[PDB]
Amino acid sequence: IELKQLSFAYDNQEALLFDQANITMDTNWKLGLIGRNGRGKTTLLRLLQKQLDYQGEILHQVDFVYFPQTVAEEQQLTYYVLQEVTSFEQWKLERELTLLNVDPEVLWRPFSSLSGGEKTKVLLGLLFIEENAFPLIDQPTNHLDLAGRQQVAEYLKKKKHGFILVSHDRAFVDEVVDHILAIEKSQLTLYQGNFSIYEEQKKLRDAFELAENEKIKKEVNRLKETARKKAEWSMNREGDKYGNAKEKGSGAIFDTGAIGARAARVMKRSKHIQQRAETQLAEKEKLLKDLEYIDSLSMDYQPTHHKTLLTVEELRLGYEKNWLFAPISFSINAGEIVGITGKNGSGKSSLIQYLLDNFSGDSEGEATLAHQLTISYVRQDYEDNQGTLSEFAEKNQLDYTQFLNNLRKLGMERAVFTNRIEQMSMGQRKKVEVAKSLSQSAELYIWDQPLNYLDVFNHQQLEALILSVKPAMLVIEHDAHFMKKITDKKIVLKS
Amino acid sequence: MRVNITLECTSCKERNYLTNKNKRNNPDRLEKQKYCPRERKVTLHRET
RNA sequence: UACAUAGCUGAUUAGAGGUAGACGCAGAGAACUGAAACAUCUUAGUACCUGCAGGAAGAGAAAGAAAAUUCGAUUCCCUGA
RNA sequence: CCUGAGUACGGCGGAACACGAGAAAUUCCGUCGGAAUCCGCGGGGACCAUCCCGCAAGGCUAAAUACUCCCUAGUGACCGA
RNA sequence: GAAGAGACGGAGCCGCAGCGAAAGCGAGUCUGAAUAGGGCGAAUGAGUAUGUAGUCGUAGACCCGAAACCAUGUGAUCUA
RNA sequence: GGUAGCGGAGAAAUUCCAAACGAACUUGGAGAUAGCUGGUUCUCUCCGAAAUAGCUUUAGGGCUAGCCUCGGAAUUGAGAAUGAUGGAGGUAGAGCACUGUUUGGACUAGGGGCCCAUCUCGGGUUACCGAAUUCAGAUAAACUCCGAAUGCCAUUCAUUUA
RNA sequence: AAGCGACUGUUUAUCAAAAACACAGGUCUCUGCAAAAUCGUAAGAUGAAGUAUAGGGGCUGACGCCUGCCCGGUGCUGGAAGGUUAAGAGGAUGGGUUAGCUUCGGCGAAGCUCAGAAUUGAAGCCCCAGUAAACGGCGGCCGUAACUAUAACGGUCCUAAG
RNA sequence: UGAGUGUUUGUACCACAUGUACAGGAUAGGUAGGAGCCGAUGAGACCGGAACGCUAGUUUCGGAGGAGGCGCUGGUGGGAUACUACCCUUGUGUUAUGAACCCUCUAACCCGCACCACUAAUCGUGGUGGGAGACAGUGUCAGAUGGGCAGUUUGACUGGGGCGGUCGCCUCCUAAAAGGUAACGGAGGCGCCCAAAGGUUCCCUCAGAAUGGUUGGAAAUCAUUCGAAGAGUGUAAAGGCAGAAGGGAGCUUGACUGCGAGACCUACAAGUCGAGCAGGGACGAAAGUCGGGCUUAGUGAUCCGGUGGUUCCGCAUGGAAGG
RNA sequence: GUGGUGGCGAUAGCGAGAAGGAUACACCUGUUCCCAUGCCGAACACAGAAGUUAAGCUUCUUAGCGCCGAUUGUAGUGAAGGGUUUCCCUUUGUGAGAGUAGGACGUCGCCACG
RNA sequence: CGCGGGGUGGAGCAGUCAGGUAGCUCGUCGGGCUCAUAACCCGAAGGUCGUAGGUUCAAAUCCUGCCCCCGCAA
RNA sequence: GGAGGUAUGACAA
Ligand SMILES: Nc1ncnc2c1ncn2[C@@H]1O[C@H](COP(=O)(O)OP(=O)(O)OP(=O)(O)O)[C@@H](O)[C@H]1O
Ligand SMILES: Nc1ncnc2c1ncn2[C@@H]1O[C@H](COP(=O)(O)OP(=O)(O)OP(=O)(O)O)[C@@H](O)[C@H]1O
Ligand SMILES: [K+]
Ligand SMILES: [K+]
Ligand SMILES: [K+]
Ligand SMILES: [K+]
Ligand SMILES: [Mg+2]
Ligand SMILES: [Mg+2]
Ligand SMILES: [Mg+2]
Ligand SMILES: [Mg+2]
Ligand SMILES: [Mg+2]
Ligand SMILES: [Mg+2]
Ligand SMILES: [Mg+2]
Ligand SMILES: [Mg+2]
Ligand SMILES: [Mg+2]
Ligand SMILES: [Mg+2]
Ligand SMILES: [Mg+2]
Ligand SMILES: [Mg+2]
Ligand SMILES: [Mg+2]
Ligand SMILES: [Mg+2]
Ligand SMILES: [Mg+2]
Ligand SMILES: [Mg+2]
Ligand SMILES: [Mg+2]
Ligand SMILES: [Mg+2]
Ligand SMILES: [Mg+2]
Ligand SMILES: [Mg+2]
Ligand SMILES: [Mg+2]
Ligand SMILES: [Mg+2]
Ligand SMILES: [Mg+2]
Ligand SMILES: [Mg+2]
Ligand SMILES: [Mg+2]
Ligand SMILES: [Mg+2]
Ligand SMILES: [Mg+2]
């Protein structure tokens, strides 16, 4: 597999997402493919499929599979949509799902009734069923739990031939992956090693860049100073060609040509020094290209007297009296974070739906908000967002400036604000949702997997901010380390 | 941003025209009804 | 170092060296110059040096030139240009 | 049965071929690797097939060609201290 | 064949047909879808060999004149 | 006696290496190169310039055009000058009709204080400073309501020459 | 009486005798012996017919009192995990051709040939530490006292250090 | 520059084992057969250990045992077992091979190590010991370092030169009523934008002032009158435009293809305008306008490479390479 | 006489004032249809003919505004000269702008109807 | 008149390159602790970043000017 | 019971 002189930009783009890429991999490498949000990972996988108009050249002679598969008829049954996408063996899929954790009764439900967990797990079953094709695996571990990730890593270690995946999940790629493509800012890189190695070497590169820049800045300032001083000296010598009209005899000067010659030599020193400074600036201009320039975040937390913001009492919840988890009682006070956890399909989003009253199932038990409580909300199902941002921020009563501010702080370049939410990457749509939440003045925050389709930098931003402000929050995550860093009030719902 | 552009006859796949456009104001792939002298008719010329 | 070889001695055999400040084979091999600067390139495989020489040398009887089914070993002049 | 083996050829590095690596055939030097032999081998300007031409890796070979320190006989719209 | 003139020697050179990148066509050709128009050409026509003079090019090229560069060699009887 | 020039020696100065060493001397390449200075030899006759544009790692050099000379050629004699006629053109001048600058006066929005009234609300005056309008007066290379003399282009127009 | 150099010496043959050079002394650094360094294509030689109290190189320059801070940068020394890192080995695949198939299209074995991947592949670079008698470097602003001035003192920013 | 051992192992054979989804008698590898098949050639089936492992178990090793057995048929499951083979993933071994790496050997190479001889010789050549040793050295190729050394470069304009500034393009003045015209003379701009800011058809006319009116002011927006341009014309200045080039709304894409008489400017290279013809269209009823914008800046040679097309060529032929 | 439609540098116009509708042009009554008004049958478009020409539109007066515009004289200036030469003067020839006298409230046609 | 470097709460400073909505330390003010003062602790105030405009969704930051300060010149 | 060793606080009054 070879990329030769590839250049590419979507029709919307001002700039080049790729500019003369020149690389070579094969079907044997266990390859990771990493980068921030909006760099071209999914785009590049499509270009490997030849699904878009690649300028330059691409060489391959191998059949591909892209996870997630593109699906229609989200109303119809899961078995129907899966047969429509790719035929398979029902029992083989049962085996894969039961090595994972979900009952095949999900197959004979509609495809949207599932959670993202079971969606992901089932399409990964479809992946695993295929044998000959070359896996392209775009963000598999998102919407997934420890057991699923463990079994998936087991499968991928057992994997004889090669594959490609996009993760954002450091430990997960470190377990399995050998080679790494890295779509850095302004260029592209290929290493042999895991994401930890990539971290180390990129830190070294950044250190070198910054140090060399500081050297150049210091030296150029020095040389500019010296140039100015030599220049003033020359001018003072040119002043000797002439005398003073106030005092007699000062003129009648002889060999002004030699005077001017020597002054010219001094100016020529000044100019040599300036040219050196210019060359050093030219060296400077090659620097600071693969950096991120990380930034903090903000949060419009607006508390009130309500020290009790949510209560739950004996809440047993489910569909058709197949009650989905044992009854629970708990509470969310002010400045307190609560980590609601469990397996996939354990009923967490169902609990959120019972709170916000849009639960189409069976309820027994109590759940009480406060009187005039304001919610901010980050859901697991943000597909519904559509259109421009100047219209999104009108549908959702926001400040457009604070909105785009929080977006750029999350790491979206301002070339992207002209795009449409249909066009943006899933990470960028996720950033739109998070920026909505952060911009909404609210008193309780309800976060249903904010951490899926984001970057490590975004993970760090969110952790630092939530640990700095410590607002009242409900949280749902499978990144157990994050919940360890933040919360102690952890609550594991289960059947 | 403002870029010089070769259009192209969708049938002949022949370029036949040079033009200009924004990417901000004209992000979608531009199209016109222009003459293809190889066909000696008018045809949908699409940017490439 | 025993067999012997080296070594030593004696008889033999043929080389040395310079010409012709000219010609020709080989080895090694410049720069000024020209390119209006200059580095590739040019001057130039020239000058210089060295070796081998002979009256000439060198090349030389096709694992060729062509496209004609054809010319029949090299060398040199004209021409191709 | 024989018909010129560390050879032709190839890789790397360099040269000469009008041909400056260029699409670079052909020839030669260094280095390393490394064939078959008559149903065979090389060339015909990358290269493959067909056709044609030739049969390397061993040697010699006069003549036409270049030059004059010199010898003889001489010549000049060459010189005349 | 007097160091000759001259004879022989038609291989080759120029011109007589050009147009086009070329295939190729041909007083036409190329561009062009094109009998269009336009360009280059023909019907308008004269060249060639030698001599001679002016001029140009390659050769030192009009005469003198550098500092300098390179390659042999000679010099420590001066002085270190 | 030894060290020899892409070098040697140097108690080190660019110093000495056969009477001038930032790289000896000699021979050859070699008649180096010189957009640089100097020179370039007999006569007469005909005609007779330029020192300008453009481009130039170009500016004291060069190339093309311009200006000169010589030969041929043809063309409704085009060329030159003067007159008549008709045109383009906005200059000197003049003017303020626009754009700017600007003087004095009438009036004045508005801006200053002083006092009464103060919720700082409404005035009344220094002939207080004064937009803007208007009267009169000025001004201009980058102002023109106007606008020449000249010069320019052209006339199967005329005259005279070539 | 003062400056320079400690001294005796050497120095620009032919404009400079000196405060310049050397000097003993000091310090740093290299070198275990076929030394290191140097001349030279190499042999060979000096070093040395020596052997770390010897030799070479750099700086300073008798003697006396001293020789402060800085290893952030440039070098050097040592180190080493990781990434990257040439030729070479490696040979996957892809074009060109064509025996043969074809359905005209087109496909295409073997061989040959043109490009040649993955993998492997040293020093070095990125990195850690040390090193300044190694290269080199050694700050600003603001106030602050019972006359006034001034600031023992304080604050602040940067620095590798001030 | 060869003799080994060992390790990491690559490949290839050949023998070994190990295959637990869920439910399910239960640790079900796929496939077909499959209801037969095994046992004193030691059954049923117990004991200790070993491997793996999902920790449920499978198998084997050894001990006891001394006679029986496994499954069918049927239930769940996609698939039911026993047993036969075709076997397939995974990881153990034998052997042959290929590399990399460490140590060991000595027989190549080497010793400014000793002794002997040539020999009177601190050379050298040999011989015998000893040491190191397939390293070094040398050759070829490649990477890093390399002023130790070499060959070279290091603009012009310019009121001397140098700095500053400038170098290409557009507009005005200078510029002397055609055109042109210089200065290190005066002032400014450009290195783009627009998919409608183009085209066509239809329609419209601005700026400001006065008056009045609510927030609403000095001034938004509304209405009348005054209103000749005092506005606007994407972007600088000049020229011009209210018969619009300004403004608005429909339909489109002529911001077409091949061209082009003839003129302007011009040293050359270039630049500018262009009626009109042909094809095929847009708008409009039609006339008729449309080969970008309001006019003038928004740009740069050749060489060299890249992309697409081509009825061009293809070193004897067909192709291909390459043009 | 009115209406339409053209040419001539508005000497044509702008303002003010008077009268008229015979036909005519106009206003005018509406939205029934073609069609239309980023709102409105105001404008566009359509149909009609109760009413008034008040307005617009015609004809007349007005020299207030604007337009045209001499003659004279001057400035400037070509050519030829002079001087006391950043300027000034003389001869000849041409000759403005301004300021006026004055003109000017239209001229020439074609067509339909009365 | 020009060339460099500066104008960020009371002082000193970042942030300016890279627009993301003003911060570090000290100081001031208030209240606590203390017999009282300092230190310490808890609070607050003080700047649209010299200024008038543009660009932008958004300017201390980018652009254009204008006004002051320190060096040179002058 | 006893011996030797093992932070700030004006001046004067
Ligand atoms: N269809 C599209 N049209 C236009 N722009 C797009 C389109 N899809 C993606 N982009 C833009 O291209 C860039 C890369 O998007 P892409 O989907 O490749 O991201 P990614 O590498 O997968 O990142 P992420 O972590 O968000 O998944 C982003 O700026 C995104 O907005
Ligand atoms: N409409 C529905 N009808 C029936 N079952 C449903 C329906 N919606 C959801 N479920 C089931 O409810 C369970 C949990 O659903 P829920 O959306 O709450 O999951 P979750 O907690 O968000 O899970 P995950 O970790 O996968 O995101 C799953 O088994 C899912 O199949
Ligand atoms: K030179
Ligand atoms: K011979
Ligand atoms: K070749
Ligand atoms: K250091
Ligand atoms: Mg993606
Ligand atoms: Mg969920
Ligand atoms: Mg030259
Ligand atoms: Mg060959
Ligand atoms: Mg070879
Ligand atoms: Mg003589
Ligand atoms: Mg005589
Ligand atoms: Mg030299
Ligand atoms: Mg001597
Ligand atoms: Mg000196
Ligand atoms: Mg020569
Ligand atoms: Mg004037
Ligand atoms: Mg003194
Ligand atoms: Mg002394
Ligand atoms: Mg003395
Ligand atoms: Mg002397
Ligand atoms: Mg000293
Ligand atoms: Mg020795
Ligand atoms: Mg040098
Ligand atoms: Mg040279
Ligand atoms: Mg100069
Ligand atoms: Mg000057
Ligand atoms: Mg003019
Ligand atoms: Mg051929
Ligand atoms: Mg051929
Ligand atoms: Mg007049
Ligand atoms: Mg206090």
From TrEMBL, chain B:
Coiled coil: none
Pfam families: Ribosomal_L33 (PF00471)
GO BP annotations, alphabetical order: translation
UniProtKB keywords: Metal-binding, Ribonucleoprotein, Ribosomal protein, Zinc
Region (Disordered): 20-48
Record-listed Zn(2+) 1 binding positions: C9, C12, C36, E39
Gene Ontology CC terms, in alphabetical order: cytoplasm; ribonucleoprotein complex; ribosome
Chain sites annotated for binding Zn(2+) 2: S11, E39, T43
Signal sequence annotation: none
Composition bias type Basic and acidic residues, residue spans: 25-48
Family statement: Belongs to the bacterial ribosomal protein bL33 family.
Protein name as it appears in the record: Large ribosomal subunit protein bL33
Organism, as annotated: Enterococcus faecalis
